[PDB]
């Protein structure tokens, strides 16, 4: 009959990323996880203990507990019409830091820094990010760049 095991349908997902089989490189074991750090869950297939279930591959969550080789990560899982707090005990070799949160925390240090010379002078430094605004006026020159293109091409089969 139907098969619904733990590593079912995980044929390509837990695979080992061509020409990067073998041992786990040591920067994974030297990374430091604190409670509140936001981590991306990507299971390493070469480590079978502490391995997340297939639902959590690619999910991102927050460290809540730290044990000897494992972080405790909180993931929100949509179950029916609500989200439920899932608490996962994963070893740190299925886990990397989310690079977005390093990009956020520098902007916090940036917005603190940019508001400092807003306090030297010139208040309301306009520190919020804005989308891609529409372009401004241009004056396109023609010196050495006279406008030229011909017409559409005819039909050729060119086999």
């Amino acid at each position: 009959g139907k098969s619904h095991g733990y590593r079912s349908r995980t044929r390509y997902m837990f695979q080992r990323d061509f020409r990067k089989h073998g041992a786990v490189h040591l920067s994974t074991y030297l990374k430091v996880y604190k409670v509140g750090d936001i981590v991306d869950i990507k299971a390493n297939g070469s480590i079978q203990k502490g391995m997340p279930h297939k639902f959590y591959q690619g999910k991102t969550g927050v460290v809540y507990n730290v044990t000897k080789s494992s972080v405790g990560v909180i993931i929100n899982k949509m179950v029916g019409n609500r989200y439920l707090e899932k608490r996962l005990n994963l070893r740190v070799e299925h886990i990397k830091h989310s690079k977005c949160r390093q990009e956020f925390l520098e902007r916090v240090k940036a917005n603190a820094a940019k508001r400092a010379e807003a306090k030297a002078q010139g208040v309301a430094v306009q520190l919020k990010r804005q989308p891609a605004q529409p372009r401004e006026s241009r004056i396109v020159s023609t010196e050495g760049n006279v406008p030229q293109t011909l017409a559409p091409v005819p039909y050729e089969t060119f086999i």
Binding site: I139, S141, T142
Partner: peptide, 9 residues
């Protein structure tokens, strides 16, 4: 001036 004014979008 031989150019093309491109409007503000």
């Amino acid at each position: 001036a031989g150019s093309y004014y491109v409007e503000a979008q």
